[PDB]
Nucleic acid binder design. Structure first.
Lengths: 1341, 380, 49
RNA sequence: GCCGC
C-alpha cells in the first residue's frame, strides 16, 4: 500500500520538505497522443485520416455525371511484430483498406443516377505504425520523429526595430500567415504610404487591392477617414462642432458660440476650454473661409444644372471653386477629417500614388505585376485573384489561424471560415493604421503564445493529404474515359503516390532520424525534443541572437538548461517535465488554484497568455496546515517580472520547483549549486554514457530515476501481474491472480526478456530478471531491468571513492588518475556489438554461390567455417578471418590448351571462380554471436538454415504448450470432480487415462450432458491447439520474398569487450569531464588510517573557477551514505538480532529536518527487514530533489550518525612513502560516467594509401585510411617559423606530386632523404579549368 | 519483402567543388611496378622490367613472347640473354610465379623457393613438372613405370603438385565490381505468366523535371514566361523515356508470349526465334528490336537472365519441322552427363541417339556442341 | 561563491531591480536560476558566433 | 546530429 513490492526491496531516503500536489507525467504521451489522433478514426472530421478523406472526397470528373463516394476505412494487421521487423530489416507497418462506391448519374435525367457499384474495399499504401515506446521501425531501424516549433498561422505586427533608413523613422508592417497558401504584407514607407507585398513580390500600393474588392475611392474615403460636414448657406459658411476631435489646434480667428464669444483667436487651448465649450450646448458656428483652404473634399458633389461636377476626390478646393459650388447649389460640402493630432493622412496619399480606379484596372494591374508574362484577357486576372486568396482549395487558414486572427482583432467569435473575407483585410489595414497613430502596440515574435508545435501525427496527416491530392488528380482524368464496367480498383487507385509520399516523409526527412540508444534517458530526451528547424522552420544562419535566447514565457514549458552548444544553441529545446500541448498546439503548464488566502488542490493548465494574466506564486513559499501562506508578503510573477505581493493577491501557485527543469536536468543532484551554463554541459554529457557490465545505482539521486527507467520502455513491467510461476534468464511466466481475469480460457503472462542485441550506437541492450521464484507481483512492478538499470532505477554510471587533491601532475588540467582496482573489478567495462552482412546475387557470369570450399585458400582459413561455409557460433575472429565463403563465377568460353591443361591437373573450375568472401575488417576483433541466414523462395535452403528453423519452431511450441497444458489440467479437474459426484473410483479412476473411458456412463444425465460436453470441449481444444501450432509452423518456414537480384543474405554479429584505458573520457554529472592520465597500482594510491585506498584522484583546481559546488556536496553526501551502509554491513557481519538492526534502520530513515517521506519499519515484515538491510548493505541510496533538497546541516548530522568527521575531510597517507599529507583531504563517493569517446575509435596513422582521382591528393578520414589535412593556418604557422623546406615537402611530394611521391619513397627506402620536388597536380587541374573558360593562362620561361 | 539486405557502402566527396572526385585502386601491374621501383635495377634493366610488366595479364602470366620483348626494345646488347635474367628477377616477386611464360614455368619457379629438404621436392621438382606433364594431366598410371617409382609415393607427389598455386598473380587482384544486375524486366508466374517493367523511374523523372524546369518557368520572378526554354524540354524528355519504355515492354511481351514454353515445365523448350518473328509481331524493323534486346535483362524464377538467349536460330533440319540447338545443347549435356562410367558419348553414337529421338543433326554438329562447353569422355 | 551573486540581467541589456542575494554555497531559488540562465545563454551564444 | 575549440 504505502510502498510497492519493487520499492520495498530498496527504499531511497528522500530529503523532501515539500508535498507534491500532482505526480509526474509519462513524458512520452505526446508522441503517443499525436499518433493516436492520427491513425485512430473519428465520428467527425476532427481527427484521423478521416479528415483528409473527407477533405478530398467526393471527387467527380468534369461533366462526367460520375462520383466517387467514400465510406469508412480500416487498418490491417501487421505481418511481423517489432522484433521480427527489426531483425529482418523491414518496415513495421499496416495495410490500409478503404471502402468506396462508384455511382453513375443519368445524362438524360438531371440530378438522377442509373448505376451504383459498391464493391468491397481497395488497398493503397502501407501506414507505418509507432511502437509502444513512440518509435517507428522503418527498414529495421528506430527512427524517432522530432516535434517542430513554428509560428502559428494568423496576423502579426512588427516594426523592424525602427532602424532601416537611418533617419530614426520606425516602419510598421502587418503580415498574414495561412496554414497553406500565399502570404500577404502591408508596409509603411518613410513617406507614410500603404504598400502591399503579395507573395513577396514587388511593392504595390494598397489602393489597387482595395479597389479589386469592388471598392470605389469615395466609398474608400468614407471608410478610410471620418468625414466632417461644411455648410455654406447665405454666405455664412458655418462649421459643425466636434469638440472631442478638436483637441490640439490654433484658433485662426475668434470663435463665438451662438453669437457669444467662446474662445478668442489664438487663445491657448486648454482641456478646460474644451470642457467649457462642450458644457455649453452650441449649434453650428461660422468660421473664416480661408481656413477651409487646406481641407480635402471627401465625396463628389454633383451639379444639378449640368453633368459637369467636381469629382476630384483626395483634392483640395480653390477660391474660384467656391463660386462654382455656390452656383451649382451645393449647400453642404463633405470633407474628411484632415486632422493630424492622433490620426494622420493615409490611404488618400496611396490613392494619389496610383490612378487605377476600376476593378478591371486593379485586377489587370495585379495580374501583370505578380505574373510578368502574357497580358490577361479579363479572365486570367479574374481567375488569378480568386486563386491568391479566399479560394477553398488554394488558400486555407487552419482552425488555429482563424482563432488567432479573430483574437488579434478583438472579435467575440472564435470559429469562422478558413478563407479571409472582404472585412478581414479591412480590419487588418485599420489595425495597422491605428498602431502607428498611437493606439495599440507591436507584438513579440518569440513569445511562446505566438509559437505553435507540430508533432508526428499532424505532419503525417499533411503528407497523406499531398498523396491524396496527387492520386485524386489522376483519378479525375480516367472518370472522363471510364465506362460503367470500370471499377474503383480500375478507377486509377494509384497506390504508388500515397505510399511514395508516406515513405518519403517517414524515411528521408529532416525531423526523421535514428533515436540515440546509448542510454534509456538519452532515448527519452530524443523522444521529448522540440526543434525550430525543418521544412516550415528557420535555417541555422537565418536565425539570430534573439531567437536563441531564453524568453520569460519559457518558464514551465521548455527547460532553460538543456540545449546543444555550438551551431544549434537555442534552436533545439526540450519539454519541461510537466509541460503539455494545447489542442490548437500551444504549450501549457499546470498551476494550483488559490481561493481567498488558501491554495486549493485543483489544478489548471495555463498557456503563456493565461499565466501572464494572473499573479502566480512561487513553489518554495511556505504554507500552513489549512493551506494559508505562513508569510503575508510572498514572491510572485505578475507580467514577465517578479516582486512582492500580498498572499490574497496571488491567484495561482507553482505546482513544483522542478516545473522549470527538464527530465534530464531533473537528474542532477544539487543542481541549484551549479552554474546554469556549466549545468548545461552536465545534462548534455549525461546522455552520452554507455552502460557497463553491471548496473550500479546512484548513491545520491533526485528521485526521478524510477520514472525515467519505467517510462522509457527499457525494462519489463508486469502488465497484469499475479504470482511468479517460472523464472529464467530468458523467460518469465506469471500466474495471474484470480481476483481479475478474462472469462474463458483462463490465462497466464509470458515475458521474453531481451538478451544481448545491437543498438543504434553499436552498444549492447540486455535484460535480466529481478524476481526469483514464487514472488508476489502487483500491477506495474518491474520484472526485468534493461541496460543501465538497477532494480527499476536509472543507473548509468558507478560510485567511485574520490579524493580531491593534486597528485604529482597526473591530474593536471582535467586529467583523471585511476587506480588498478577499478580495472581489475571490471567497472567501466562495456560490451560492443557489430553487424556484418554478406549477400549473394545472380550475375551475367551466373549465380553467386556460398560454399565452404574456396579456391586458392589454405585449410587454416577454413578451420572455423561450417559445411555451408559460415563461421561456427562462438568462434573468436580477429584480423581478416573469413566469415562467409562466397565465390562468383568468371566469364570464359575459349578453352586455351593451357587452360585445358590447368583444368586437367587441377579441379574442374581450375580456380576460375573468383573469391568474394566476407572477411573481418582489420582492427575488428569479435566473437561469433548470431547468424541470420535468409533464403529466397524456391532456391535450396541453406544447410545451416534448417537449424535456425528448428530452434524457432522448438521455441514456438515450448512457449505455446503452457496454456494448452493449463487448460487440459483444468478440464481434467472438472472431469474428476464430475466423476467424484457420481461413481467415483478415486485412485482407480485417476490411474486409467481418458478418465477411465469417461467413467462409462453412470447416470443418464451425466453421460448425456456432463461427459459428452467434456469430450466435446476436449476435442475442440485439441483441434484448436493443433491448428494454431500448424499455423505458427507454416509461418516460421516460408520463402523470403527478396529483391529480384538478391539470392541469399547472411548476417553475422560480433561481440567485443572494451577494457577501460587512459585515452578514454570520463565525466561526472556536474559538467566535470576529463580523460584518464594513468592507471596506478593499488599500493601507490592514497589511503586512510584503516588502510582503504581511494579509487580516483581529482584536481581541486577544477572546482573554484568552474563554480561546480554540487561536486563537493555530492561527494560529502556520498561519504555519508556509504558510512551508513558500512554500519549496516558491519551489523550484518556479526549476525546481530533483527530488533536492533531494525532500530538502526528506523533511526537512519527518519533523520532530517521535517522531511515529507515517512517510513516506519513497524508495518514491515521481519523477513522483509532483513532483505531490505541486505539490499542497502553497500550504501543508503539518498534522494535530494532538484531545487528542494538536502542542506549542509542535514548532511552533517547524517555524517555524525555514520560516525564520520563532520567537515567531510579525513587524514590521508602517501602510498609510496607512507607519510601523512599536511592538510586534511576531502574523501567521499561520486557518480562517474564513461562516455562514448574512445582512443581506439580515435587513433589513426597513415604512411601511404589511396588518393583522390581529382587533384591526386590523399583521401580524408579514418575508415578510409586518410591523411590529416594541413590547412591554411598550418601553412601560415610554417611561414611564420621560416621553415621553407618543411612546407615544400608538405605542399609538393607526400601530397600531390605523383612522381615526387614515388621518388621520395624510393630515396627513403635507400636511406637518402632527398626531396627532389616537382609540380602539384592540383595546379595543373586549375590551369585546365581556367583554360576551359575563355581565358588563356600560361607559364612563361 | 520478407527480408531486406542492408544498404551497400557508398560514398561521395563532401566539402569539395568537383563532387564525387574519385579514388585510386591497386592492380596487379600497379603492384608489380611498385616492386620494380624498389629493387636495384639499371636504366636499361628498368626499361626491360617495364616492358615485360606491361605484358602481364590479369592472371599474372606473360602473354607476349620473350623474343617479342627483345624486338620491342630494339636496342643493341639487349638480347634474350639479359631479358631472361630480368624476367626471372621479376618472376621472383611477391606473387611468386607471376609473369611466367607458361604453366610449367609457374610450377618450376614456385618449387625453386622451398626448404630444399621437402619430403618430395626433387621427386616433383622436374620429374613431374618439367617432364611428363601430360601424363600428370591424365591418370599417370604409366608414369609410375616411367619415373621408376611406386604409385604410393606419386600419390603424394601429385598432392604437392596440387599444393603449388595454379595461377599466381590473381590473389593480389581485388575484385570490387560484382557486376550485379538490376533485372529491369521482372516477370512472375501466374495463370498465364504475366510480365512487368520495373526500374522505369519515368514518374520520378517526370516529377523532378517538372519541379525543376516547369518550377522555374512557373516562378514569376523572371520577366515574361519560360514556356519554351525548359517547359518544352521536359516534355521531350518524358516522351523519349516513355517511348523507350513502351518499346522495351512490347518487345519483351512478344518474347515472353513466344517462349512461354521455356518457362513452363522444363527449361529446354526454346523455339528458334528469329529477329523477323518478333519484327512481324510488333510490326517494326528487326534492327530496332535487336538493338533493344542486346543488354536488357529479365528476372526469372528459374529462367536464364538474358533476352538474346531466346533467338536460337537453329532449325537444324530437325525431323518434324524445326528445333533449337540450345535446347539440343541442353539435351546433349544431360545425355552425356548421365552415362556409364566408361561414358563413350561418341559423336557418331550421340548423333545417332539424337536422330532416334527425332533430331536429325549431323555427326559433326553434335561435336561442336559438346566442345563448346565440355570435353569428350574418352570418346577417342 | 561566498558573497552575493550580484546584479545581472541580459534579456535586452537592462538590469533587474532585485538582485540575486544568494551565493553558490547556499542554494538559488527557481527564479534566481531562471534569471541567471539569460546571461548564461547570452554568453554561450556569443562564443559560438 | 555530435566532439574540441
Amino acid at each position: 500500500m504505502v510502498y510497492s513490492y519493487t520499492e520495498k526491496k530498496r527504499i531511497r531516503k528522500d530529503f523532501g520538505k515539500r508535498p507534491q500536489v500532482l505526480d509526474v507525467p509519462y513524458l512520452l504521451s505526446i508522441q503517443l497522443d499525436s499518433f493516436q489522433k492520427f491513425i485512430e478514426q473519428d465520428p467527425e472530421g476532427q481527427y484521423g485520416l478521416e479528415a483528409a478523406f473527407r477533405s478530398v472526397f467526393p471527387i467527380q470528373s468534369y461533366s462526367g455525371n460520375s462520383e466517387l463516394q467514400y465510406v469508412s476505412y480500416r487498418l490491417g494487421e501487421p505481418v511481423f511484430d517489432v522484433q521480427e521487423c527489426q531483425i529482418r530489416g523491414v518496415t513495421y507497418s499496416a495495410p490500409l483498406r478503404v471502402k468506396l462506391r462508384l455511382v453513375i448519374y443519368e445524362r438524360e435525367a438531371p440530378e438522377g443516377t442509373v448505376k451504383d457499384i459498391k464493391e468491397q474495399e481497395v488497398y493503397m499504401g502501407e501506414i507505418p505504425l509507432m511502437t509502444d515506446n513512440g518509435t517507428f521501425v522503418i527498414n529495421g531501424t528506430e527512427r524517432v520523429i522530432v516535434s517542430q516549433l513554428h509560428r502559428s498561422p494568423g496576423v502579426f505586427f512588427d516594426s523592424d526595430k525602427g532602424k532601416t533608413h537611418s533617419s530614426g523613422k520606425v516602419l510598421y508592417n502587418a503580415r498574414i500567415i495561412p496554414y497553406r497558401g500565399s502570404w500577404l504584407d502591408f508596409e509603411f514607407d518613410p513617406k507614410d504610404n500603404l504598400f502591399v507585398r503579395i507573395d513577396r513580390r514587388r511593392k504595390l500600393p494598397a489602393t489597387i487591392i482595395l479597389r479589386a474588392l469592388n471598392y470605389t475611392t469615395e466609398q474608400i474615403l468614407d471608410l478610410f477617414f471620418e468625414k466632417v460636414i461644411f455648410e455654406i448657406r447665405d454666405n455664412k459658411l458655418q462649421m459643425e462642432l466636434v469638440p472631442e476631435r478638436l483637441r490640439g489646434e490654433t484658433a485662426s480667428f475668434d470663435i463665438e458660440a451662438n453669437g457669444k464669444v467662446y474662445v478668442e483667436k489664438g487663445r491657448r487651448i486648454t482641456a478646460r476650454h474644451i470642457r467649457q465649450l462642450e458644457k455649453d450646448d452650441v449649434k453650428l458656428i461660422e468660421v473664416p473661409v480661408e481656413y477651409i483652404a487646406g481641407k480635402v473634399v471627401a465625396k463628389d458633389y454633383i451639379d444639378e444644372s449640368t453633368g459637369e461636377l467636381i469629382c476630384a476626390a483626395n483634392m483640395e478646393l480653390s477660391l474660384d471653386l467656391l463660386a462654382k459650388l455656390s452656383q451649382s447649389g451645393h449647400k453642404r460640402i463633405e470633407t474628411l477629417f484632415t486632422n493630424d493630432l492622433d490620426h494622420g493622412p493615409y490611404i488618400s496619399e496611396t490613392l494619389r500614388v496610383d490612378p487605377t480606379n476600376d476593378r478591371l484596372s486593379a485586377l489587370v494591374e495585379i495580374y501583370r505585376m505578380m505574373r510578368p508574362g502574357e497580358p490577361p484577357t479579363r479572365e486570367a486576372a479574374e481567375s488569378l485573384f480568386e486563386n491568391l486568396f479566399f479560394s477553398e482549395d488554394r488558400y486555407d487558414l487552419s482552425a488555429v489561424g482563424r482563432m488567432k486572427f479573430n483574437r488579434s482583432l478583438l472579435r467575440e467569435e472564435i470559429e469562422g471560415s478558413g478563407i479571409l473575407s472582404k472585412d478581414d483585410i479591412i480590419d487588418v489595414m485599420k489595425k495597422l493604421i491605428d498602431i502607428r497613430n498611437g493606439k495599440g502596440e507591436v507584438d513579440d515574435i518569440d513569445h511562446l503564445g505566438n509559437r505553435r508545435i507540430r508533432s508526428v501525427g499532424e505532419m503525417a496527416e499533411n503528407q497523406f493529404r499531398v498523396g491524396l491530392v496527387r492520386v485524386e488528380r489522376a483519378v479525375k482524368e480516367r472518370l472522363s474515359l471510364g465506362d460503367l464496367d470500370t471499377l474503383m480498383p480500375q478507377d486509377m487507385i494509384n497506390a504508388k503516390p500515397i505510399s511514395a509520399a508516406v515513405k518519403e516523409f517517414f524515411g528521408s526527412s529532416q525531423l526523421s532520424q535514428f533515436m540515440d540508444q546509448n542510454n534509456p534517458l538519452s532515448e527519452i530526451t530524443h523522444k521529448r525534443r522540440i526543434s525550430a528547424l525543418g521544412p516550415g522552420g528557420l535555417t541555422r544562419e537565418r536565425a539570430g541572437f534573439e531567437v536563441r535566447d531564453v524568453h520569460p514565457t519559457h518558464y514551465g514549458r521548455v527547460c532553460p538548461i538543456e540545449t546543444p552548444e555550438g551551431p544549434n544553441i537555442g534552436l533545439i529545446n526540450s519539454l519541461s517535465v510537466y509541460a503539455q500541448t494545447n489542442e490548437y498546439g500551444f504549450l501549457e503548464t499546470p498551476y494550483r488554484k488559490v481561493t481567498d488566502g488558501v491554495v486549493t488542490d485543483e489544478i489548471h493548465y495555463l498557456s503563456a497568455i493565461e499565466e501572464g494574466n494572473y499573479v502566480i506564486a512561487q513553489a518554495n513559499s511556505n504554507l500552513d496546515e489549512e493551506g494559508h501562506f505562513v508569510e503575508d508578503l510572498v514572491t510572485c510573477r505578475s507580467k514577465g517580472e517578479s516582486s512582492l505581493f500580498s498572499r490574497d493577491q496571488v491567484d495561482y501557485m507553482d505546482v513544483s520547483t522542478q516545473q522549470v527543469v527538464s527530465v534530464g536536468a531533473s537528474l542532477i543532484p544539487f543542481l541549484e549549486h551549479d552554474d546554469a551554463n556549466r549545468a548545461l554541459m552536465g545534462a548534455n554529457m549525461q546522455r552520452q554514457a554507455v552502460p557497463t557490465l553491471r548496473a550500479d545505482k546512484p548513491l545520491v539521486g533526485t528521485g526521478m530515476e524510477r520514472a525515467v527507467a519505467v517510462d522509457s520502455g527499457v525494462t519489463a513491467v508486469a502488465k497484469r501481474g499475479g504470482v511468479v510461476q517460472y523464472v529464467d534468464a530468458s523467460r518469465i511466466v506469471i500466474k495471474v491472480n484470480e481476483d481479475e481475469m478474462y472469462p474463458g480460457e483462463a490465462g497466464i503472462d509470458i515475458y521474453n526478456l531481451t538478451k544481448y542485441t545491437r543498438s543504434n550506437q553499436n552498444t549492447c541492450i540486455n535484460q535480466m530478471p529481478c524476481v526469483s521464484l514464487g514472488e508476489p507481483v502487483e500491477r506495474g512492478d518491474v520484472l526485468a531491468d534493461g541496460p543501465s538499470t538497477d532494480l527499476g532505477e536509472l543507473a548509468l554510471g558507478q560510485n567511485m571513492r574520490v579524493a580531491f587533491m593534486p597528485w604529482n601532475g597526473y591530474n593536471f588540467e582535467d586529467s583523471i588518475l585511476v587506480s588498478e582496482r577499478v580495472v581489475q573489478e571490471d567497472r567501466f567495462t562495456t560490451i560492443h556489438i557489430q553487424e556484418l552482412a554478406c549477400v549473394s546475387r545472380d550475375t551475367k557470369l551466373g549465380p553467386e554461390e556460398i560454399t565452404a570450399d574456396i579456391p586458392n585458400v589454405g585449410e587454416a582459413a577454413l578451420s572455423k567455417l561450417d559445411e555451408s561455409g559460415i563461421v561456427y557460433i562462438g568462434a573468436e575472429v580477429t584480423g581478416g578471418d573469413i566469415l562467409v565463403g562466397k565465390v562468383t563465377p568468371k566469364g570464359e568460353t575459349q578453352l586455351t590448351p593451357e587452360e585445358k591443361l590447368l583444368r586437367a591437373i587441377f579441379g574442374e573450375k581450375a580456380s576460375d571462380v573468383k573469391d568474394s568472401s566476407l572477411r573481418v575488417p582489420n582492427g575488428v576483433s569479435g566473437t561469433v554471436i548470431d547468424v541470420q541466414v535468409f533464403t529466397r523462395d524456391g532456391v535450396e535452403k541453406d544447410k545451416r538454415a534448417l537449424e535456425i528453423e528448428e530452434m524457432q519452431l522448438k521455441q514456438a511450441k515450448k512457449d505455446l504448450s503452457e496454456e494448452l497444458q493449463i487448460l487440459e489440467a483444468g478440464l481434467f479437474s472438472r472431469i474428476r470432480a464430475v466423476l467424484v459426484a457420481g461413481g467415483v473410483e478415486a485412485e482407480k479412476l485417476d490411474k486409467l487415462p481418458r478418465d477411465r473411458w469417461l467413467e462409462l456412463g453412470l447416470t443418464d444425465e451425466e453421460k448425456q450432458n456432463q461427459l459428452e460436453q467434456l469430450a466435446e470441449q476436449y476435442d475442440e481444444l485439441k483441434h484448436e491447439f493443433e491448428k494454431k501450432l500448424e499455423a505458427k509452423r507454416r509461418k516460421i518456414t516460408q520463402g523470403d520474398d527478396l529483391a529480384p537480384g538478391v539470392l541469399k543474405i547472411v548476417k553475422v554479429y560480433l561481440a567485443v569487450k572494451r577494457r577501460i584505458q587512459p585515452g578514454d573520457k570520463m565525466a561526472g554529472r556536474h559538467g566535470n569531464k576529463g580523460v584518464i592520465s594513468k592507471i596506478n597500482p593499488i599500493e601507490d594510491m592514497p589511503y586512510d588510517e584503516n588502510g582503504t585506498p581511494v579509487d580516483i584522484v581529482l584536481n581541486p583546481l577544477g572546482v573554484p573557477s568552474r563554480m561546480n559546488i554540487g561536486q563537493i556536496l555530492e561527494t560529502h553526501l556520498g561519504m555519508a551514505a556509504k558510512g551508513i551502509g558500512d554500519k549496516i554491513n558491519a551489523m550484518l557481519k556479526q549476525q546481530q538480532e533483527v530488533a536492533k538492526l531494525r532500530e538502526f534502520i528506523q533511526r537512519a530513515y527518519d533523520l532530517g529536518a521535517d522531511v515529507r517521506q515517512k517510513v516506519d519499519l513497524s508495518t514491515f515484515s521481519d523477513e522483509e527487514v532483513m532483505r531490505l538491510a541486505e539490499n542497502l548493505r553497500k550504501g543508503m541510496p539518498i534522494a535530494t530533489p532538484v531545487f528542494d533538497g538536502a542542506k549542509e546541516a542535514e548532511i552533517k548530522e547524517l555524517l555524525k550518525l555514520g560516525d564520520l568527521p563532520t567537515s567531510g575531510q579525513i587524514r590521508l597517507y602517501d602510498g609510496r612513502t607512507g607519510e601523512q599529507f599536511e592538510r586534511p583531504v576531502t574523501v567521499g563517493y561520486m557518480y562517474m560516467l564513461k562516455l562514448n569517446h574512445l582512443v581506439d575509435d580515435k587513433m589513426h596513422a597513415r604512411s601511404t594509401g589511396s588518393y583522390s582521382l581529382v587533384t591526386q591528393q590523399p583521401l580524408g578520414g579514418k575508415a578510409q585510411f586518410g591523411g590529416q589535412r594541413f590547412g591554411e593556418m598550418e601553412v601560415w604557422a610554417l611561414e611564420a617559423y621560416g621553415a621553407a623546406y618543411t612546407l615544400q615537402e608538405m605542399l609538393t611530394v607526400k601530397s600531390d606530386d605523383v612522381n615526387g611521391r614515388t621518388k621520395m619513397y624510393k630515396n627513403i627506402v635507400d636511406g637518402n632523404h632527398q626531396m627532389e620536388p616537382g609540380m602539384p597536380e592540383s595546379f595543373n587541374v586549375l590551369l585546365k579549368e581556367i583554360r576551359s573558360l575563355g581565358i588563356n593562362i600560361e607559364l612563361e620561361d | 519483402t520478407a527480408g531486406t539486405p542492408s544498404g551497400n557502402g557508398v560514398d561521395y566527396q563532401d566539402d569539395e567543388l568537383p563532387v564525387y572526385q574519385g579514388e585510386t585502386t591497386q592492380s596487379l601491374q600497379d603492384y608489380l611496378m611498385w616492386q620494380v621501383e624498389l629493387t636495384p635495377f639499371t636504366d636499361t634493366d628498368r626499361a626491360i622490367a617495364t616492358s615485360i610488366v606491361d605484358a602481364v595479364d590479369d592472371t599474372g602470366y606473360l602473354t607476349i613472347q620473350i623474343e617479342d620483348i627483345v624486338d620491342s626494345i630494339g636496342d643493341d646488347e639487349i638480347g634474350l640473354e639479359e631479358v631472361e635474367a630480368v624476367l626471372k628477377r621479376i618472376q621472383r616477386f611477391d606473387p611468386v610465379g607471376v609473369a611466367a611464360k607458361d604453366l610449367r614455368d609457374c610450377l618450376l619457379i614456385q618449387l625453386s623457393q622451398f626448404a630444399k629438404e621437402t619430403p618430395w621436392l626433387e621427386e616433383a621438382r622436374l620429374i613431374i613438372s618439367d617432364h611428363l606433364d601430360l601424363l600428370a594431366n591424365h591418370d599417370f598410371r604409366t608414369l609410375m613405370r616411367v619415373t621408376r617409382l611406386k604409385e604410393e609415393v606419386l600419390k603424394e607427389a601429385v598432392n604437392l603438385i596440387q599444393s603449388l598455386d595454379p595461377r599466381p598473380g590473381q590473389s593480389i587482384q581485388t575484385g570490387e565490381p560484382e557486376y550485379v544486375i538490376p533485372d529491369v524486366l521482372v516477370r512472375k508466374v501466374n495463370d498465364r505468366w504475366v510480365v512487368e517493367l520495373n526500374s522505369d523511374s519515368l514518374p520520378r523523372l517526370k516529377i523532378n523535371q517538372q519541379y525543376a524546369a516547369m518550377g522555374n518557368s512557373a516562378r514569376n520572378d523572371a520577366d515574361g514566361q519560360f514556356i519554351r526554354s525548359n517547359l518544352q524540354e521536359a516534355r521531350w524528355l518524358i516522351k523519349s523515356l516513355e517511348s523507350a519504355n513502351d518499346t522495351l515492354l512490347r518487345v519483351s511481351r512478344c518474347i515472353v508470349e513466344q517462349q512461354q514454353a521455356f518457362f513452363e515445365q522444363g527449361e529446354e523448350y526454346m523455339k528458334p526465334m528469329v529477329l523477323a518473328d518478333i519484327a512481324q509481331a510488333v510490326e517494326m524493323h528487326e534492327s530496332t528490336i535487336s538493338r533493344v534486346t542486346t543488354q536488357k535483362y529479365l528476372h526469372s524464377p528459374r529462367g536464364i537472365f538474358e533476352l538474346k538467349y531466346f533467338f536460337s536460330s537453329h532449325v537444324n533440319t530437325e525431323g518434324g519441322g524445326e528445333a533449337s540447338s540450345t535446347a539440343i545443347r541442353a539435351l546433349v549435356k544431360k545425355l552425356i552427363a548421365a552415362e556409364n562410367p566408361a561414358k563413350p558419348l561418341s559423336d557418331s553414337k550421340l548423333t545417332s541417339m539424337l536422330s532416334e529421338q527425332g533430331i536429325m543433326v549431323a555427326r559433326r554438329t553434335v561435336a561442336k556442341y559438346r566442345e563448346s562447353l565440355s570435353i569428350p569422355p574418352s570418346n577417342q | 561563491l561566498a558573497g552575493m551573486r550580484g546584479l545581472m540581467a541580459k534579456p535586452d541589456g537592462s538590469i533587474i531591480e532585485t538582485p540575486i542575494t544568494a551565493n553558490f554555497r547556499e542554494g538559488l531559488n527557481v527564479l534566481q536560476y531562471f534569471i541567471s540562465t539569460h546571461g548564461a545563454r547570452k554568453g554561450l551564444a556569443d562564443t559560438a558566433l
